[PDB]
Amino acid sequence: TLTEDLDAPQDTGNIENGAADNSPQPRTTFDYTGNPLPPDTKLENFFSFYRLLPMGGSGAPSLSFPADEGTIIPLDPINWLKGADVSGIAAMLSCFTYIAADLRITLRFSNPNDNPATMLVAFAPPGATIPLKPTRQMLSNFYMAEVPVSAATSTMVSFSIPYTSPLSAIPTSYFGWEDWSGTNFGQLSSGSWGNLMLIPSLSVDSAIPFDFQLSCWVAFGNFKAWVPRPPPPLPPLPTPAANAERTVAVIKQ
Amino acid sequence: LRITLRFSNPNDNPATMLVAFAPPGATIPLKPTRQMLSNFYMAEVPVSAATSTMVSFSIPYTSPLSAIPTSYFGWEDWSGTNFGQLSSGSWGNLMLIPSLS
Amino acid sequence: HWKTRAVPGAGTFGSAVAGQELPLCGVRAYYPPNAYIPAQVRDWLEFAHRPGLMATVPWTMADEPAERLGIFPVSPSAIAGTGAPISYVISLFSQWRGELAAHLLFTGSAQHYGRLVVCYTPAAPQPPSTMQEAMRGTYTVWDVNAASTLEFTIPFISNSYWKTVDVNNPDALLSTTGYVSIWVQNPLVGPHTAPASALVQAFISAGESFNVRLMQNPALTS
Amino acid sequence: HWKTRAVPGAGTFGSAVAGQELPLCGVRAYYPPNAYIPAQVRDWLEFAHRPGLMATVPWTMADEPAERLGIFPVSPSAIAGTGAPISYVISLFSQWRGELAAHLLFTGSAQHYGRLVVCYTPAAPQPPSTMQEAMRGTYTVWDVNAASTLEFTIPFISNSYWKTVDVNNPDALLSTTGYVSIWVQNPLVGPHTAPASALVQAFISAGESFNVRLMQNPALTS
Amino acid sequence: HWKTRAVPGAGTFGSAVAGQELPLCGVRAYYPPNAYIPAQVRDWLEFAHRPGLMAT
Amino acid sequence: TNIYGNGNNVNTDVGANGWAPTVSTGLGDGPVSCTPPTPSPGDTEVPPPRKPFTFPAPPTKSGSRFSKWWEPAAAPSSTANPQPSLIALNPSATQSGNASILTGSTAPSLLAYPTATPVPLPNPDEPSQPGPSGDRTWLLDTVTWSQEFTRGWNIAGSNGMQWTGLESLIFPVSTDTNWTSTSSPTAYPLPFSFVRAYPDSSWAAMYNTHSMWNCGWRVQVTVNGSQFHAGALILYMVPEATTHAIQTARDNAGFVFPYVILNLYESNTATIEVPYISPTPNTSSGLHAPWTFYLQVLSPLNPPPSLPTSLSCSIYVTPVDSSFHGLRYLAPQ
Amino acid sequence: TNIYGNGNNVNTDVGANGWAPTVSTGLGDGPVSCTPPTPSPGDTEVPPPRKPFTFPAPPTKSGSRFSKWWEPAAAPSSTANPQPSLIALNPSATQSGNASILTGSTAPSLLAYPTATPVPLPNPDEPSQPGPSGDRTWLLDTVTWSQEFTRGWNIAGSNGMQWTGLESLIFPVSTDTNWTSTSSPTAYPLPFSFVRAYPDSSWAAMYNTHSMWNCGWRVQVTVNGSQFHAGALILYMVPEATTHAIQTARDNAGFVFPYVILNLYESNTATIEVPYISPTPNTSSGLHAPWTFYLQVLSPLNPPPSLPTSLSCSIYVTPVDSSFHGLRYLAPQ
Amino acid sequence: PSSTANPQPSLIALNPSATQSGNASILTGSTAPSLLAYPTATPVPLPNPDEPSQPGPSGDRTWLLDTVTWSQEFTRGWNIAGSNGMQWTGLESLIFPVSTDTNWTSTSSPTAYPLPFSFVRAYPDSSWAAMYNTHSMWNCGWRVQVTVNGSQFHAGALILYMVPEAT
Amino acid sequence: TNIYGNGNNVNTDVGANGWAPTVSTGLGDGPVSCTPPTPSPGDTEVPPPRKPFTFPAPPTKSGSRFSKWWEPAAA
């Protein structure tokens, strides 16, 4: 403090080194004091909450698979970023290259036609051959779930998948190939958390088979993210131009 | 503040409400979408087809005002008007979007 | 047999809740050891301390001493439109408190001279008008040759212990603090071999004590 | 796996019950410290001790010694119509026991003289008629110049340990106690410069030991 | 009486899960002793060490 | 019996315990709850006049907590004695920064709410406080009392805001449009109507350019009627609210606030000592006036016949232990 | 309270405990989780240059565990001292295997990420590492700087891969089809564009025939403008990703990577020290280039009038603590 | 000081320095001569009995007076000043009361600014200004600071006299 | 076995214990119940002719319990 100082130290510095100094300057008449950090910042606390992933290569939020045919629902974190929205789970993982967690899915699906039904949900650990046309006997060895779905609609279910990847760290972006000879550039099919293949069933087996509709929430746990990348762009606000400078920094004056 | 809300759908089909809590202050999207609404906090309320399906909630005290006024004499915006009320003192907002399969 | 009655929830799926999912695997398996990947990130504030570039401000040889180069107004509304870090982090959370430092480079010839004033004026109905009125709240008259960079500190001076992140109502209480500014004081001088103009670029990185809480979807798109 | 049978309740939502609501948040957050806001209220009886104004009673220079200024009858029915505190608190609860004190101001010239009698007559089929019959149960003959105010105490004399708060059946047992009263005794005297009349205002505030229980909606509207 | 709300699973049959099946018998009965049958196999890797003929 | 029976004495959860390892466990869930933050230090200033101004927290360490990934390692009214009527002497006096007010007879004087404990300030700066000027007792408009006012008439001088002004005040503050109308004014909000009529005073000089302000207030009214006059007044000193929510043409239960009846029988004077009640440590300048001072009539004063019907009175208002934080260009208000 | 209250401080299961006897019990079920394997020994090599090469695990025991059924029994930037402009002397030098680079003025030099601890290798073999050659500082293409480049122009020499080359590169590697096009090239991936132009060097001789390779990288650029020039550059050294996901015509937040601004005001030089970040201990040869080195313009250099507009610069790239595992026939790439 | 043990380098060398105040502060490069004119005298008991009212900033920090333009045609001892100075003839026969605007506006002005009088002018809003009007006797120590940055090739000099009271 | 087996000798809840920390807990709920008030003193008179007329409770203290918000400290 002391108020008026002739000799007080300068605020000059250098930001050219990679490291940036953010410590507060000791200005006179100012008592700068630290603050405790509230625990919404830590990752493992912030990613433990469910969020909605974009389904398929594109065309989120929901996927509609016709009856009698299973959809494989790839869990590649690289497939999510394709056609990824600016805001969502999709674009948050774009900040880290490598992530490791036990991915907990909760998926819900609503059958428009009115009869009760059962989905058979299986998890094929990476990598595992997905049968081209799944059969109840073949699909079953992997791991089982039987989801009774309410006749009207909206029957949920949750899952807990441990971390099976042999990559140690699954990349959210990969620059290079996969096959030695083949192409498949820019992605790796063995880094991820299995696949969920699911085959619907109907006992009545009525005509007008129709199509089921679903969407799923995904929340990591025991999360670890090894190297950062810059977050995606957020569209800026419009310029009011009536009275500027109230919001939106002016410049070039 | 602990809310318990119930809602009854006159038409007969089962249904689901998606109940979210936007902590004060938070921008409420003008037209909510399932993806946008979801980040905040989630609830899935299955509602009985006939009617009367309830649900409860527990909301901790999020206000930065320390104390929320039940009457406020003064303005809110510096330039704007909004006299006699403050939009940042309260307990979020519950935005909820129905759905039918 | 125990006896139980069903609390009215009866199948509601929460976002934040304990357990609730049956395991879909077994044979718990260890994850290849991964001690070798560096720079492990444990926080979202570990971004807030890595700077980002708000705006490039032109500086010119022929200019008056009173003109203002730029006047960004501190806010979750104004910073979010820049695109830097903390532009994003402030946006992804619904409340913030702390003191965010604003660095300023100088990109110019080794021979240039002049003084930028960096004013910080806490909240008020109209913005500043001139250096004379604007230059009150705080300032550091900064020479352009001492270190090649200036580390300023935007204090946190305001009522509440927290500040809301608001967009649709930007000029609202608790949603803003005062304006910053950059004013000419002594215009450039230099030999006639030296370049005509020199840019001044302004970085914003949240200093120590910057904190946030209460998750919300990014508040820019919405 | 445990085994359970469902008690017939099966989804009834109570008013007073433990838990029953899934948390809709997490990241428990501390509330800015608030030690500086004074006069923190911990009770509903902390209102009952702050007086309120029942009625203003006129007093006049030309009057007989036997006339009665006012005769409020104690009750949750009579007090509730006044609008004071304890008018409201008694109303918002369904039973009350205790002794509620009745203050009386005197607003008048420094020179006035006279004696109000404050009678308290416990329950009986008809009300009082005259000071002679009314003035039995208890009274304090009060001079109008000693302190400028009189602190009386309406005792609690009645059968049961509690009293119901009833409205639709006001003249009912356990719902009332006796009447109060204010009777002239010695009419005003004063010099002929002094004002003609002087008002006497009567405050009611529940004294010590006043208690209540068993919540109900305010019993006035209903 | 305890009070419980039903997590959304509500009757899903897992593959790997604890219990979930009511016993259909009782009178627990010992299995004739069987110490005499040799070459008890405890692993699937105990096959991996027994060779097989790829190609001639 | 561990972590059970919570919020005892009632069959409900009162959130007796802010947090337990037990609540929110996977097996069972209770309602959530909160705990106090302790934002370390700061010029501990909250309610006057208990504010020390010394910061408990260490200053300038700026330690931080999380380890950055780019660094290798880092670390009365009792009936025992009754006050006599105004005939008896009973001297008293209430002073202030310099100006002081003597009185005779009996002067009711109270301190409305006991002074609360201090709390650490959110912002870091040194408050600038001025000894008088900005202290002492400032004289607001002297209001005339008249006989024709019935019960609860809300008498006020020329500096009060009008009834309709208490709603839809407009911007910014004093436009002179809401302060001039037929029949006015009902009452004066304390922060807004003090600056008006006193721009010269330092308190006035301040509170313009300083943004957030902190003051406790004490109001004093003086009415001396002759030994033969009879009447009463009330000083409510209502905390912030619109009059419509505070009181409408009733004023019957209005004694819950601070009141201190004047009662022209035994008293010439009344005071109130009010610590300031506002959310957040410091209100913003030019808006949000927390206290509003109403002056009402319990009983119409009927003067001795043959003497003038009107009677005069004044209102003395003064800050207590003022403070300010932050600077900026001058703002009219 | 045993095995309860998990992942404290939040109302959720954070998987604080990898395993407990309690979780997955018949009575109640929690989410699953994992624990580290410790695949006993192996030439403990992971990140340069902390790699010891000595195997902790016993070698040659090959004990096994399960009992076979056919055997009977078996067993800075601190403001304390600010770096002067390029006028002042302030010598510095950064050496390497043999070649070394002197500098004057102020040279910003950093080590991007702190060196991680070693981890046991999956495969069993002895890594073959060559002292220089394969060390020292190799000179990549000298790129010309020009005035007409606006902000974020991505200047690069003749050895860089073109923009469209960063997508759909094709096989195998250099076809010369993606490396020659009008206006190029945007930037050079570090592993791929180092072998190109340096087949003779041993590092080049290796990495062809050795399959998996392990190297930390350090890049250095040298620009000396006259005391009167003004401009800036940035060295991003972006980890692996397509440019489209990394940055598109914006580069506004791109400082999250390592950066080390050149800033032709006070500096002639910049370096970066990067440990290699890739999944699995060792990347495969001929594919998967983890680091990519972008060089961008913050502000257009406007030269002193009457002097030539162009300005020249070079880029020095070198490995750190190389290693290799496994052999095979020569592969072009 | 001025001791020949260590000589201050020319403006080419870096040599940082800064001089702060209540809130506002002024950085500088090169060499900044800064002195304290007279050593602080000891206190003495006040004649009057009262408590002084002193304001922390506002009324502290650094107030910016008029920015004066320097021109080449000024010979030695030209007394350059801005728009807030009192004119030469104003230094004699000022008149009452204080600023009449008659002595502050004339062809060619002004020679210099008396410190107490020309500070209030141009700063009525500041608290120091709010004070010193209504408070009668005032007590302040003063510090004045001028900032001129010419290019490495300019050559010149200035002096700051800070003359005590006299015509 | 704590707070269990209530109203023994019958398969029902007899309200043997008026109150326990255990009952009404969030985890489980039992039927409610009551306990005697003891309205301190008063001329202890109820059934003749055992009535003493002497008040056990202190007379004239009128202590009260809750602390009024307008008093600084009181006890």
XYZ file of C-alpha atoms in Angstrom, chain C residues 161, chain D residues 33-37, chain F residues 43-48 50-53 116-121 214-215 276 278 280-282:
29
model
C -19.745 -11.835 -5.179
C -21.344 -15.122 2.837
C -24.255 -13.234 4.324
C -23.440 -12.235 7.879
C -24.185 -8.550 7.368
C -27.951 -8.460 6.896
C -11.369 -4.975 3.269
C -13.841 -6.529 5.686
C -16.617 -3.965 5.364
C -20.327 -4.704 5.624
C -22.507 -2.935 8.174
C -21.791 0.425 9.809
C -18.494 -2.154 12.777
C -16.301 -2.103 9.668
C -12.578 -2.440 10.508
C -11.180 -2.008 6.927
C -24.477 -7.219 12.092
C -20.991 -8.711 11.879
C -18.583 -7.845 9.041
C -18.001 -9.949 5.941
C -15.155 -9.936 3.397
C -15.712 -7.682 0.375
C -22.242 2.145 1.796
C -24.002 4.142 4.525
C -28.577 -0.509 5.952
C -29.453 -4.403 0.994
C -24.778 -7.682 -1.904
C -22.297 -5.732 0.237
C -22.626 -2.418 -1.601
